[PDB]
Amino acid sequence: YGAGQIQVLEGLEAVRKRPGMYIGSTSERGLHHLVWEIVDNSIDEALAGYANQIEVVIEKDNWIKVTDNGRGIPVDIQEKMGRPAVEVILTSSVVNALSQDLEVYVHRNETIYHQAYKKGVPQFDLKEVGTTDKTGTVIRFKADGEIFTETTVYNYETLQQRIRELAFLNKGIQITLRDERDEENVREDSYHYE
Ligand SMILES: Cc1[nH]c(C(=O)NC2CCN(c3ncccc3[N+](=O)[O-])CC2)cc1Br
Ligand SMILES: [Mg+2]
Ligand SMILES: [Mg+2]
Numbered sequence: 001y002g003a004g005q006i007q008v009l010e011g012l013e014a015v016r017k018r019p020g021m022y023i024g025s026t027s028e029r030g031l032h033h034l035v036w037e038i039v040d041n042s043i044d045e046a047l048a049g050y051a052n053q054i055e056v057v058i059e060k061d062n063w064i065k066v067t068d069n070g071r072g073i074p075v076d077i078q079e080k081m082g083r084p085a086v087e088v089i090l091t092s093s094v095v096n097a098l099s100q101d102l103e104v105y106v107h108r109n110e111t112i113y114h115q116a117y118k119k120g121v122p123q124f125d126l127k128e129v130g131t132t133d134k135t136g137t138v139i140r141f142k143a144d145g146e147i148f149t150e151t152t153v154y155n156y157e158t159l160q161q162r163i164r165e166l167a168f169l170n171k172g173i174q175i176t177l178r179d180e181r182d183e184e185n186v187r188e189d190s191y192h193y194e
Helices: 003-017 019-023 028-047 085-091 156-169
Strands: 053-059 063-068 099-108 111-118 127-131 136-143 174-179 187-191
Touching: 003 019, 003 085, 019 028, 028 053, 028 063, 028 136, 028 156, 053 156, 085 099, 085 111, 156 174, 156 187
Parallel strands: 053 174
Antiparallel strands: 053 063, 063 136, 099 111, 099 136, 111 127, 174 187
16 A cells, blocks of 8 residues: 555566566576575575575476575564565565465574465465474475466476585585475485585
8 A cells, every 4th residue: 555565566567577687588597597586595694604504496386495594584574664574575576576476484483484475466464374493484486487488397407507506606505406396206416515
Protein backbone atom coordinates (compact mmCIF):
# COMPACT_ATOMS: atom_id res chain seq x y z
CA TYR A 1 0.00 0.00 0.00
CA GLY A 2 2.76 2.44 1.02
CA ALA A 3 5.58 4.02 -1.00
CA GLY A 4 7.71 1.02 -0.01
CA GLN A 5 5.58 -1.79 -1.48
CA ILE A 6 4.99 0.36 -4.57
CA GLN A 7 8.73 0.58 -5.35
CA VAL A 8 9.19 -3.18 -4.73
CA LEU A 9 6.43 -4.03 -7.22
CA GLU A 10 7.78 -1.56 -9.80
CA GLY A 11 11.21 -3.16 -9.27
CA LEU A 12 9.86 -6.65 -10.00
CA GLU A 13 8.10 -5.40 -13.15
CA ALA A 14 11.37 -3.83 -14.38
CA VAL A 15 13.46 -6.98 -13.89
CA ARG A 16 10.90 -9.20 -15.64
CA LYS A 17 10.56 -6.70 -18.52
CA ARG A 18 14.32 -6.69 -19.31
CA PRO A 19 15.87 -9.78 -17.63
CA GLY A 20 18.98 -9.76 -19.86
CA MET A 21 20.10 -6.33 -18.61
CA TYR A 22 20.25 -7.81 -15.08
CA ILE A 23 21.66 -11.30 -15.73
CA GLY A 24 23.26 -11.03 -19.21
CA SER A 25 20.81 -13.19 -21.17
CA THR A 26 17.89 -15.61 -20.74
CA SER A 27 19.81 -18.44 -22.44
CA GLU A 28 21.36 -21.43 -20.63
CA ARG A 29 24.13 -19.02 -19.50
CA GLY A 30 21.55 -16.76 -17.82
CA LEU A 31 19.86 -19.74 -16.15
CA HIS A 32 23.18 -20.73 -14.55
CA HIS A 33 23.84 -17.09 -13.51
CA LEU A 34 20.86 -17.38 -11.11
CA VAL A 35 22.83 -19.93 -9.10
CA TRP A 36 25.90 -17.66 -8.96
CA GLU A 37 23.83 -14.71 -7.76
CA ILE A 38 22.61 -16.72 -4.76
CA VAL A 39 25.95 -18.46 -4.08
CA ASP A 40 27.86 -15.13 -4.17
CA ASN A 41 25.83 -14.02 -1.11
CA SER A 42 27.03 -17.08 0.85
CA ILE A 43 30.64 -16.51 -0.29
CA ASP A 44 30.51 -12.88 0.96
CA GLU A 45 29.12 -14.07 4.31
CA ALA A 46 32.05 -16.54 4.57
CA LEU A 47 34.61 -13.87 3.64
CA ALA A 48 33.00 -11.61 6.27
CA GLY A 49 33.97 -14.33 8.78
CA TYR A 50 30.54 -15.85 9.55
CA ALA A 51 30.20 -18.93 7.30
CA ASN A 52 32.35 -21.79 6.01
CA GLN A 53 29.99 -24.31 4.36
CA ILE A 54 27.92 -23.94 1.20
CA GLU A 55 25.75 -26.60 -0.40
CA VAL A 56 24.19 -26.37 -3.85
CA VAL A 57 21.64 -29.06 -4.75
CA ILE A 58 19.99 -29.65 -8.10
CA GLU A 59 16.66 -31.03 -6.93
CA LYS A 60 13.85 -32.81 -8.78
CA ASP A 61 12.34 -30.76 -11.67
CA ASN A 62 15.44 -28.52 -11.69
CA TRP A 63 14.80 -26.65 -8.48
CA ILE A 64 18.01 -25.30 -6.99
CA LYS A 65 18.65 -25.28 -3.23
CA VAL A 66 21.49 -23.23 -1.76
CA THR A 67 22.32 -23.66 1.95
CA ASP A 68 24.95 -21.87 4.02
CA ASN A 69 25.89 -21.82 7.71
CA GLY A 70 26.18 -18.03 7.95
CA ARG A 71 24.27 -15.79 10.36
CA GLY A 72 20.96 -16.11 8.49
CA ILE A 73 19.28 -13.22 6.68
CA PRO A 74 17.81 -10.99 9.43
CA VAL A 75 14.07 -11.08 10.15
CA ASP A 76 13.73 -7.89 12.25
CA ILE A 77 11.08 -5.38 11.21
CA GLN A 78 12.77 -2.78 9.06
CA GLU A 79 12.53 1.01 9.38
CA LYS A 80 12.14 1.77 5.66
CA MET A 81 9.55 -0.87 4.69
CA GLY A 82 7.96 -1.87 8.02
CA ARG A 83 8.51 -5.48 6.89
CA PRO A 84 10.96 -8.22 7.88
CA ALA A 85 14.47 -7.52 6.53
CA VAL A 86 14.54 -10.87 4.72
CA GLU A 87 11.35 -10.02 2.82
CA VAL A 88 12.76 -6.66 1.71
CA ILE A 89 16.04 -8.23 0.53
CA LEU A 90 14.42 -11.10 -1.38
CA THR A 91 11.66 -8.97 -2.98
CA SER A 92 14.51 -6.92 -4.53
CA SER A 93 16.38 -10.08 -5.66
CA VAL A 94 16.73 -10.57 -9.43
CA VAL A 95 16.76 -14.35 -8.83
CA ASN A 96 13.42 -14.09 -7.01
CA ALA A 97 11.86 -11.89 -9.72
CA LEU A 98 12.93 -14.39 -12.43
CA SER A 99 11.82 -17.50 -10.53
CA GLN A 100 8.33 -18.96 -10.86
CA ASP A 101 8.73 -20.02 -7.21
CA LEU A 102 11.27 -19.22 -4.51
CA GLU A 103 11.45 -20.29 -0.86
CA VAL A 104 13.60 -19.10 2.02
CA TYR A 105 14.26 -20.78 5.36
CA VAL A 106 16.28 -18.67 7.79
CA HIS A 107 17.88 -20.34 10.82
CA ARG A 108 18.37 -17.54 13.35
CA ASN A 109 17.52 -16.73 17.00
CA GLU A 110 17.11 -20.52 17.53
CA THR A 111 14.09 -20.29 15.22
CA ILE A 112 13.36 -21.38 11.64
CA TYR A 113 11.56 -18.68 9.63
CA HIS A 114 9.92 -19.38 6.27
CA GLN A 115 8.58 -17.31 3.37
CA ALA A 116 7.65 -18.20 -0.20
CA TYR A 117 7.38 -16.06 -3.32
CA LYS A 118 6.18 -16.32 -6.93
CA LYS A 119 7.88 -14.06 -9.49
CA GLY A 120 9.16 -12.08 -6.49
CA VAL A 121 5.75 -11.59 -4.87
CA PRO A 122 5.44 -12.86 -1.27
CA GLN A 123 2.74 -15.53 -0.94
CA PHE A 124 2.33 -15.06 2.83
CA ASP A 125 3.95 -13.17 5.72
CA LEU A 126 7.24 -14.54 7.08
CA LYS A 127 6.24 -17.44 9.37
CA GLU A 128 8.00 -19.23 12.25
CA VAL A 129 7.83 -22.95 11.40
CA GLY A 130 10.12 -24.58 13.97
CA THR A 131 13.28 -24.33 16.07
CA THR A 132 16.99 -24.89 15.46
CA ASP A 133 20.40 -24.83 17.13
CA LYS A 134 22.25 -23.65 14.00
CA THR A 135 22.28 -20.44 12.01
CA GLY A 136 22.13 -20.11 8.23
CA THR A 137 20.12 -19.41 5.13
CA VAL A 138 18.43 -21.88 2.80
CA ILE A 139 17.18 -20.67 -0.58
CA ARG A 140 15.17 -22.94 -2.95
CA PHE A 141 14.15 -21.59 -6.37
CA LYS A 142 12.62 -22.77 -9.63
CA ALA A 143 13.59 -20.68 -12.67
CA ASP A 144 10.69 -19.07 -14.53
CA GLY A 145 10.12 -20.81 -17.88
CA GLU A 146 8.39 -17.64 -19.14
CA ILE A 147 11.76 -15.88 -18.78
CA PHE A 148 14.13 -18.77 -19.59
CA THR A 149 12.36 -19.88 -22.74
CA GLU A 150 15.21 -21.92 -24.29
CA THR A 151 15.88 -24.18 -21.29
CA THR A 152 15.36 -24.50 -17.53
CA VAL A 153 17.57 -27.63 -17.22
CA TYR A 154 20.87 -27.27 -15.36
CA ASN A 155 24.17 -28.77 -16.58
CA TYR A 156 26.04 -30.52 -13.74
CA GLU A 157 29.46 -29.98 -15.36
CA THR A 158 28.78 -26.24 -15.73
CA LEU A 159 27.91 -25.84 -12.03
CA GLN A 160 30.75 -28.18 -11.02
CA GLN A 161 33.50 -26.28 -12.89
CA ARG A 162 32.59 -22.94 -11.30
CA ILE A 163 31.87 -24.40 -7.84
CA ARG A 164 35.32 -26.01 -7.85
CA GLU A 165 36.86 -22.70 -8.94
CA LEU A 166 35.04 -20.79 -6.18
CA ALA A 167 36.40 -23.22 -3.58
CA PHE A 168 39.90 -22.89 -5.06
CA LEU A 169 39.69 -19.07 -5.05
CA ASN A 170 38.14 -18.86 -1.56
CA LYS A 171 40.25 -21.34 0.39
CA GLY A 172 38.72 -22.71 3.60
CA ILE A 173 35.11 -22.66 2.38
CA GLN A 174 33.63 -26.13 1.96
CA ILE A 175 31.46 -26.04 -1.18
CA THR A 176 29.38 -29.10 -2.06
CA LEU A 177 27.39 -29.78 -5.24
CA ARG A 178 24.84 -32.58 -5.41
CA ASP A 179 22.50 -33.68 -8.21
CA GLU A 180 19.32 -35.31 -6.84
CA ARG A 181 17.23 -35.06 -10.05
CA ASP A 182 17.47 -38.85 -10.50
CA GLU A 183 16.98 -40.37 -7.04
CA GLU A 184 18.29 -43.75 -8.28
CA ASN A 185 21.64 -42.20 -9.26
CA VAL A 186 22.84 -39.30 -7.10
CA ARG A 187 26.13 -37.53 -7.84
CA GLU A 188 28.02 -35.34 -5.36
CA ASP A 189 31.31 -33.42 -5.52
CA SER A 190 32.70 -31.67 -2.41
CA TYR A 191 35.47 -29.08 -2.55
CA HIS A 192 37.45 -27.77 0.39
CA TYR A 193 40.85 -26.22 -0.30
CA GLU A 194 43.30 -25.68 2.58
C1 LIG B 1 22.05 -17.84 0.38
C2 LIG B 1 22.18 -16.52 1.07
N1 LIG B 1 22.96 -16.28 2.15
C3 LIG B 1 22.83 -14.96 2.50
C4 LIG B 1 23.50 -14.33 3.63
O1 LIG B 1 24.24 -15.02 4.32
N2 LIG B 1 23.27 -13.02 3.89
C5 LIG B 1 23.91 -12.38 5.05
C6 LIG B 1 23.96 -10.85 4.88
C7 LIG B 1 24.43 -10.22 6.20
N3 LIG B 1 23.45 -10.62 7.23
C8 LIG B 1 23.28 -9.80 8.35
N4 LIG B 1 23.56 -10.29 9.55
C9 LIG B 1 23.42 -9.60 10.67
C10 LIG B 1 22.95 -8.30 10.62
C11 LIG B 1 22.63 -7.74 9.38
C12 LIG B 1 22.79 -8.49 8.22
N5 LIG B 1 22.47 -7.93 7.02
O2 LIG B 1 22.83 -6.80 6.74
O3 LIG B 1 21.82 -8.55 6.19
C13 LIG B 1 23.49 -12.05 7.53
C14 LIG B 1 23.06 -12.80 6.27
C15 LIG B 1 21.93 -14.37 1.63
C16 LIG B 1 21.54 -15.37 0.73
BR1 LIG B 1 20.33 -15.14 -0.71
MG1 LIG C 1 8.96 -17.80 18.82
MG1 LIG D 1 36.76 -24.89 6.11
